Amino acid sequence: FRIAQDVVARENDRRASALKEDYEALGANLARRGVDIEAVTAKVEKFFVAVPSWGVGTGGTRFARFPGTGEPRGIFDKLDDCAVIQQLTRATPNVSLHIPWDKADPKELKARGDALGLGFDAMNSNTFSDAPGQAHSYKYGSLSHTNAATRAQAVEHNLECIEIGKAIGSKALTVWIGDGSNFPGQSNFTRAFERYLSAMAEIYKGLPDDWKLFSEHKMYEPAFYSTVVQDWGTNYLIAQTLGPKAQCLVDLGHHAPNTNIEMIVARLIQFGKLGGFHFNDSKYGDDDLDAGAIEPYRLFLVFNELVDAEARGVKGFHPAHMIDQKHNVTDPIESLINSANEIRRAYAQALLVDRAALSGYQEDNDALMATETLKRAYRTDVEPILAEARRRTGGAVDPVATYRASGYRARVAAERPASVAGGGGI
Template sequence: MTMTKIDSAFVKAQNEKEAAFLQRDFDALGEKLSRDGIDIEALTKAASDFQIAVPSWGTGTGGTRFARFPGIGEPRNIFEKLEDCAVINELSGCTDSVSPHFPWDKVDDFTELKQRSDSYGLKWVSANSNTFQDQPGQVASFKYGSLSNTEKASRDAAIQHNIDCIQWGEQLGTKSLTIWVGDGSNHPGQQHFQRAFERYLDSAAEIYKALPADWEMHLEHKMFEPAFYSTIIQDWGSNILAAMQLGPKCKSLVDLGHHAPNTNIEMIVARLIQFKKLGGFHFNDSKYGDDDLDSGSIQPYRQFLIFNELVDAAYRKEPEFDPAYMLDQSHNVTDPIESLVNSAIEVQRSYIKALLVNREALYGYQDANDAMMASTELKKGFNTDVSPILAMARYRKGAAISPIPTYRASNYRKNVDKVRPRDPKATGSGII
C-alpha cells in the first residue's frame, strides 16, 4: 500500500507549536459569540463535518491559451493525483473526496484504483466527461460540437463517452455525472440556435436513460469559451430548462466563474433551490470572465452570500436540498496543493460565517422592509473572523492548524519530485 508523504507525527509536532495560542484565540472568540447566544462548539462541529471535493485535474499546474509552465513533482497519472489529494485532506481536514475526469483518469483496473483511494480514506464523487477535445484515435471529431454536433457520428461518440463515464463511475462508487460541453458558435449565422439545442437535448436524453436509479446528472453552463458568440448551455436559464426537460434526476450545476461579470449568482442559487434543481457547485473565483482563480480570492463576500442562501435553505428544511460541493480551479503560478488547501478552507469559512446569521432576526428585518438592518445582519456574520473555529476543527481532526506553513516545512513537493521525473515532452497535468 502506498503511504501518504506527510507523516501524521510531523503534522502533530507542527501543531503543538501553536496549540496553546489557538486555544486562547478560540476561547476569546467563544466568549464573544456567547454574548449573542451562539455556541462555538456547535460551529466547530459544523466546520468539522463540512467537506468539499477536490478535482483530480486540479492537482496539476494549469495554464492559459498561450502556455503552461509545469512545476516540479507534478502528478503524472491518477494514482499520483490521489497521493496529492490525500495530502490536501491531511492538511485541510475538509476534502475527503475526489472528482475524476474521463478519459484523463481512465485506468485498466478500476478495482485497483478504488483500493488505492480506500487506503487514503478518500471517496469518489461526480464523474466528469470530456467531449470538449478530441482524444487520440478518435474518428468522429468534436471540433464543431459534441452532443449538439450536426454530424450524428460525433453525437453518438459523445453519448457513448458519457455512458462509459457512468460505468467507470459506478466502479468507483460515484453517484452523479457532470456534463459540460464547449458546443456553440463563433460567428453569427453559423448555427441554428433552436435546432442545436434540440440536438443537445436529444443526446442528453440518451445519457439520462443510462443513469442508474440512484444517480443524478448535473448540467454545467458557461457563458463563453471555447465558443465566443454563442454556447449551447450559456446560462442558468438554458440550464434549468434542459434539466426540467430531461427529468427529476437531472439538475443544474453552478460554476461561480461561468457567469457574466456582476451577475447575481446568489439569486440564481435561490431560484434553483426553489424549483429543486440545484445539483451542486464548482467553487472558484473570477475577476473578468475567467473561471480559474482560487476560491474567495477576489470576491469573498459574494461567496458568503451564496452560502447565506444555502444555509437558509437548510434552516428552512427545503425538500430535496443536498447540493454537491467541489473545487474547480486552474493553478498557473501557485503550487496546486497550496491553492486547493487554501480554497477549501475559504469555502468552509464562508459556510461557517453564514451560520452566524440570525435567521429569525433577518426574516423580521425583511418583512419590515428594513434594508439597513437586514444588510447589517449579513455583514455582522461576514465580518466575524472565524479562523479559530476552522483551525480548532482541523486540530481536533489531526489536520494542520496552519496548513500552508506545515506543507512547506514538510518539503513534500521537493521530496515527491525525486520519484516523479517529468517527461520533457509533457506540458503538465492540469487544464490549459
C-alpha cells in the same frame, strides 16, 4: 499518511497556545451573541467539498503553461496529492475524476482511494477535446454536433463514464461541453439545442436509480459567439426536460459580468434543480482562481442562500459541492488547501447569521439593519473554528505551514519526472 504524523503533531503543538487563546476569545464573543461556538465547529467539521483530480496539476492558458516541480504523472500521482489536501484540511474526502484523463482500472482506482482514505465524487465526461484514435472530431461540437455519428460517439462516452463511476462508487455524472459557435449564422440556436436535448435524453436513460445527471452552464469559452448551454435559464430548461435525476450545476466564474449569482442559486433551489456547485473566484472571465481570493463577500452571500435553505428544512436538499479551479502560478496543493479552507470560512460565517433577526428586518423593510445583520456574521473571524475543526479531526492548525514543513513538494519532485514548459493547454 502522505504527511508524517509527527510533523503534523509538531506543527500543531507549535500553534496550540495561540489557537486556544483565539478560540476561547471567539467563543466568549459568540456566547455574548447568543451563539454556542461548539455547535458551529461541530457543523464545520462535517462540511466537505470535492477536489478536482485535474486541479492538483499545474494549469495554463492558451498562451503558456509553466509547470512546477514534481508534477503528477497520472491519476495515481494525483490521488496521492489529493490525500495530502484531505489529511491536512479534513475538508476534501472525495475526489472528482475526469475521463479519459483519469482512465484506469476501476479496481486499482477504488483500491488506492480506500488506501488513501479518499472517496469519489461525480464523474466528468470530456467531449470538448479529441483523443487519439477518436473516430469523430468534436471540433464543431459533440452532443449537439450536426453529424449523428458524432452525437452517438459522445453519448457512448458519457455512458462509459457512468460505467467507470459505478465501479468506483461515484453517484453522478457532470456534463460540460464546449458546444457552441464563434460566428453568427454558424449555428441555428434552436436546432442545436434540440439536438443537445435529444442526446442528453439518451444519457439520462442510462443513469442508475441513485445517480444524478448534472448539466453545467457557461456563457463563453471555448465558443466565442454562442454556447448551447450558455446560462442558468437554458440549464433549467434542460434539467426540467430531462427528468428528476437531472439538475443544474453552478460554476461561479461562468456568468456574465455583474450577474447576481446568489440569486440564481436561490431560484434553482426554489424549483428543486440546484445540483451543486463549482467553487472558484474570478475578476474578468472564467479565471478559475482560488476560491474567495478575489471576492470573499460574494462567496459568503452564496453560502447565505445555501444555509438559509439548510435552515428552513428543504428536506430534499443536498447539493454536490466541488472545487473547479486551475492553478497556474502557485503550488496546486497549497491553493486547493486554502481554497477548501476559504469555502469552510464562508460556510461558517453563514451559520453565524441571526436568521430570526434577519427575517424581522426583511419583513420590516429595514434594509440597513438587514444588511448589517449579514455583515455581523461575515465580519467575524472564524479562523479559530476552522483551525480547531481541523485539529480535533486529525488535520493541521495551519495546513500550508505544515505542508511546507513536511517538505512534501521537494519529496515528490525527487520521485517524479522533471517537467518542461510549453504552449497553451490546461
